[PDB]
Write a protein that binds this ligand. Sequence first.
Ligand SMILES: [Zn+2]
Lengths: 74, 74, 74, 74, 81, 158, 62, 96, 217, 52, 88, 75, 52
Amino acid sequence: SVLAASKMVGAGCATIALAGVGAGLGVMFGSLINGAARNPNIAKQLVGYALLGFALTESIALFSLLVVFLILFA
Amino acid sequence: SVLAASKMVGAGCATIALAGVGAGLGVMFGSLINGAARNPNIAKQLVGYALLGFALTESIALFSLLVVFLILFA
Amino acid sequence: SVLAASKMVGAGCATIALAGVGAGLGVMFGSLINGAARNPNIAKQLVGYALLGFALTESIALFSLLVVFLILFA
Amino acid sequence: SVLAASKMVGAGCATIALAGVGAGLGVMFGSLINGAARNPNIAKQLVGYALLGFALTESIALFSLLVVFLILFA
Amino acid sequence: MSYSAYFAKAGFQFPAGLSALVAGIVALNVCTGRPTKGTKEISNAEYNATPIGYLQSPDQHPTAFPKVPGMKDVHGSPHHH
Amino acid sequence: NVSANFTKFETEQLLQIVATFDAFNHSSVAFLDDVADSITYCNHYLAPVRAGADELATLLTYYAKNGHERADLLATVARGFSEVSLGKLSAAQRKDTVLSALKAFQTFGFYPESIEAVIGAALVSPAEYSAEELKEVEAVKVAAENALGGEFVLIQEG
Amino acid sequence: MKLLPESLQQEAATAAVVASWVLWHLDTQLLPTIMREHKLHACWAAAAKRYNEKLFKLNPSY
Amino acid sequence: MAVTSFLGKAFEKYFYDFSAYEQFGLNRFLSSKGQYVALRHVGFVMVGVNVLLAANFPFNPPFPTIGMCPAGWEGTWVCQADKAKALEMYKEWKKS
Amino acid sequence: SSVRDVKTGSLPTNFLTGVYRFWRSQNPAEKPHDPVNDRLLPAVVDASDKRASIGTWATTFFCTIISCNLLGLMPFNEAPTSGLGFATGLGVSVWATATILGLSKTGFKFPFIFVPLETISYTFRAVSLGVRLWVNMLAGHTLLHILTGMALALPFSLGFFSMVPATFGVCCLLSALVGLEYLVAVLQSGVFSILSTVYVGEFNHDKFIGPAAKIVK
Amino acid sequence: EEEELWLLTLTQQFKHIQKHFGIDLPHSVVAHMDPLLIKKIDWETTNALEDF
Amino acid sequence: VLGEVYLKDILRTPPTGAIPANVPHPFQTSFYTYATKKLIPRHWYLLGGFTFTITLYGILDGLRDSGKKKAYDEAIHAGKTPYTAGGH
Amino acid sequence: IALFGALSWILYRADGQSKAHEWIVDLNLNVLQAAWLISFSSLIPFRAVYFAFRGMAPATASTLNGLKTFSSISL
Amino acid sequence: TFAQRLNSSPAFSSFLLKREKAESEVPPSELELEAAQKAAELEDPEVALRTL
Ligand SMILES: [Zn+2]
């Protein structure tokens, strides 16, 4: 069971990328607050961009988690 | 035996994703403070955006917790 | 035992996640000082937001400390 | 055996490279929100640059993921 | 007056082609080509030879509210190699 | 039957019916008015756009042969003539359609803004047109220039 | 926990059947009704001025 | 005489008229109505999980215990971590 | 052969009108150089004929994906989208729809080492579009199952009515997680359809057959 | 009263539509009252011009 | 005067006798008109995408079945059990 | 048919959730989802949601602007 | 008024809108109320003939 042991170690080392994607997502949402404070008249437009931005940013998390699944339950 | 030991090792290593989402949440709430200082008349609205951002950022945080509890207990 | 030894190493690796929590907390409090300097008239209100943001970031720290518990004593 | 064990460990180490890609996507989309709040009349054009920037950042994620399967399934 | 009683006259009605949707999903779930999950296509002589309980594998009959995770309702084929 | 319930008929059905009634010399005044009323008022105003310019030219030559003048129907079926519908045709069929439409428009004395897409379809490729046909097209071109209020140029690619 | 299903083609065909039914139901049952309401209101709102001026010109009652 | 008419009217009277935020006078204990809705939500979750656990028990849980038993089954057949050993211990516990 | 009667101004009609007009507004038509009149109307109609129905396709994908995503949150129910084949079949379907449209624009012709790199960068949209929505649905259900077990363990090993504050806190966390799953269901349906519109609007562009001859004044 | 039927039926039909439209008017009553408008609307949905 | 015969199928009043049947769209009437007028001329790209994904996933099922049968073949050739029985 | 098919689907899915390996967390996920279906009946402002959806469609967002009285008068 | 007609519509007979009134979302104007009163007064056609 050294393979399953390395599976646990590899998945635990695999989810480090969620840190970077969370820092980026917090940067993007803080800029959404900033851009709404600069120009609130288009704020409901900006939130849309934010959601779209969060969208693509989230994908980099899920390609992390998929590898975790490909490590754990493949 | 070796498997439970590596489960401890991996569930510890998976936790470090919480650092980046903590940094992202801190950047986002600091930008909430800056945008509330720059424009208090929409400040409550900005808090809502922060909470929205908080929710989405917490998803990434909870994703990391998922792998911890997929390694520690599963 | 190698289980308790790996519990020590995993609790250390889980404790690493407090770093980004402290970094985002420092970023948020520095932005509190900057937003109070740009606009002191609403400054106490900003402190409220700061404490709010602090509490939500502490949730992540709580979760990280939770994982340390679940490695150390479980 | 030990080789497949190292495949799991190296795949988990190789998908750490998505952290900076997620952080860079977050910085880029946050700048998109800031630039659209700054000049909304060209905002659609900025979204094009964002997609262009996205198309040249996630390729780096491809160069991680192409390695990951090369660690896993080769 | 109003047309409120005219619309209260008509009862609940399905979406217009829902029977085609349920027919397509059922025809995808029953016309697969492969046998049912868990089961194996055996010969007719083997099927007529074995009793009921020996033909049922224990993995396909889980206990309804199991006191222990992994309880099976039937115990199949004690006669095996 | 067509004159009884003309409101039910669509434009494509009326164009096929008018093509058959134009192959023979069969027409009444009431039938012509009911077909024109049905195409103009009872049908969508972009239904000549989905027609194909040979069907519309058949209808135009039908109304020109029978002498029935309906300026609203002419303004409706002039919409179907464009670069798109004439470009859908083959070269001989486009020449026949342009000659039929220009002859009918000169008969009625009606020169819409969309006659030039007919005229241009004869002047972008004047290799298939004979000299008397080119004289006919230039007669309708000068007449449309006088009616529309300007001179006829071709637009290039840019 | 398994990532892959018993047949990927069966699940893909289920998604295709569900989305094609939503496409047919949208184009056939929903969008005609939607456009009947919307294009009635929009045709009246787009033609109010021209319609009332044309009917004012036709009306001999003034 | 009809059942579904009375069921609709009764569920309407329970949904709209019956309000335990004012009937029990909970405006003194709780601040607002939305706070009561949140606490009634979480109380519904708590009562539901306790009814499920309380419904059928004692059993070996498929969910991971954090090394804690129910204080009456230290090592009988409920806290067993290995499942086949817990199954045979359940059998010799069911023979009693 | 008789159709049903519809009340004008029903709430589903209004909701689907707003949804269709949204996904239709995502790819707007280009303004021509000439003023739109009866000379330009067949050019406008042919421009609408050459434009793909991305409003109908995006409304289709939005409605089916938000229906399955919200099916995941009904009791006794899992999302079809949390299956791998379902969600990634929808993703490969949108990518192949965009690719088939773009190939048919180029005369059914398939497309200096920049071309395989851009080919892999374009081909990864087929993976990303389905894996994003499928991964989000799978992660949310998996996180809830792991979280539910911990919550169940707290009253299983500490008494049914003997530990009120910790059970209350962890059920607050679970309830906030299910509310987040509602938000993620709606968001991932909207994200799938927005990325669908941009992927097909990369190839929606076509030639405007305007007037080739005109009267100048 | 040479043409009062046509004007008065226009007034009555639009008054009924405007009175009932977004509230409770059925589609059948609309397609009865204005069948050619419903025909021209159905032409747009048929010929893929439903967003014209 | 302007009679009722000029208004016959053009312009009607609100119904006094009974509410009529709803007029069907041509797509609600027949699937052939929907298929030949709008499903094939407009939505054949989406249908080709569904056809491609079903073809591709059949190819992936074929690859998975080939790999699984190969593992089963070398497992029964090695003399060992291909599957773990388990405990009931 | 709809109510009996929904009840048969609910019973069949609850039976299959009982048979499942993590059965108790399945039956508690049902409680966690039914809690939110309960709380949505209390939280959502259904009148404001109705009129927001009325504003979503242009047919219900405005009044019919059509035939005026002075044009179609008959003296 | 438009709000009264919305209250008499089927949508406000449904279960989630039984106790709601459309006036609370958008109240009718003073012109709309006086015109509803005037139209109710003119619903008698003999009164309309005498008034005109
Ligand atoms: Zn589940």
